[PDB]
């Protein structure tokens with residue numbers, strides 16, 4: 196109740212997203228089931244935390260009180276506790292709630308009821324667990340509507356838990372686009388601001404099946420002095436926003452898809468990491484073992500070069 200967010204940002208440090216798992220409709224549908232040993236592997240390689248994308252919306256009733264289903268809550272307990280056991284900090288969020296993005300009015304009560312339940316569930320867990328409000332707000336959930344939503348969410352959470360650091364993202368899909376429009380209530384002072392970074396989007400997502408028209412970006416490379424300047428400019432913008440609004444920064448997701456040439460990916464990833472570190476930002480790579488992966492779960496081997504870029 197006198198906790199520091201910048202310190203909590205230090206505790207986050209370097210992390211990795213365990214994606215295409217709990218944020219799919221059912222765990223495993225997208226290729227990944229979170230095994231307990233992943234936490235050993237991740238801690239052993241040097242990471243300080245894991246970010247866990249969770250699709251609470253498909254595992255909660257659609258009518259008041261929007262109760263989260265017992266079996267699912269039990270599964271999330273098990274994942275969080277498995278990470279904590281290895282000494283890893285943990286970031287959990289609400290992920291892929293598409294109905295909310297498309298109709299924020301109709302789904303507002305359900306979304307806040309999810310947080311009421313989650314805060315209640317974990318209010319007494321370690322201070323190394325972080326609550327990330329909503330992954331990539333977008334579409335009809337405009338930057339203005341997001342500022343209202345996030346303040347309601349902080350109110351719901353803080354009425355229950357005044358200990359855990361809350362992580363707040365940006366609208367327009369959570370990148371830099373809407374950063375200037377973000378308003379974090381002056382009254383809330385234990386929050387970290389999160390930005391996802393995938394620019395040049397065409398490079399990072401080239402050939403992504405889930406992005407319309409991405410097959411036209413296939414073959415794009417990255418690495419020129421030109422490229423580097425463009426990125427620093429964008430990070431300085433974040434940094435200056437950060438200094439002005441006095442909020443720590445967490446780059447909760449960043450990565451380049453497997454269809455991008457390997458060397459460009461390694462150059463883009465190592466550069467992004469060094470620049471984030473110079474600005475003393477925490478970060479989480481997207482993602483552990485799937486389409487943007489750095490670890491092969493079958494052979495149990497890392498992509499050395501990519502891991503090194505991360506460290």
Ligand SMILES: OC[C@H]1O[C@@H](O[C@H]2[C@H](O)[C@@H](O)[C@H](O[C@H]3[C@H](O)[C@@H](O)[C@H](O[C@H]4[C@H](O)[C@@H](O)[C@@H](O)O[C@@H]4CO)O[C@@H]3CO)O[C@@H]2CO)[C@H](O)[C@@H](O)[C@@H]1O
Nearest residue numbers: 214215224225226330331391400403405448481485486487
């Ligand atoms: O649908 C049945 C089909 O599913 C296949 O799994 C696919 C899945 O269909 C597809 O939606 C999913 O796409 C993921 C993508 O892999 C993942 O990297 C991306 O992560 C986002 C993140 O969620 C965002 O918040 C932000 O951080 O950006 C990143 C990167 O863009 O999320 C998308 C969500 O659509 O990929 C799955 C395969 O890995 C099954 O494989 C197939 O068997 C089934 O028939």
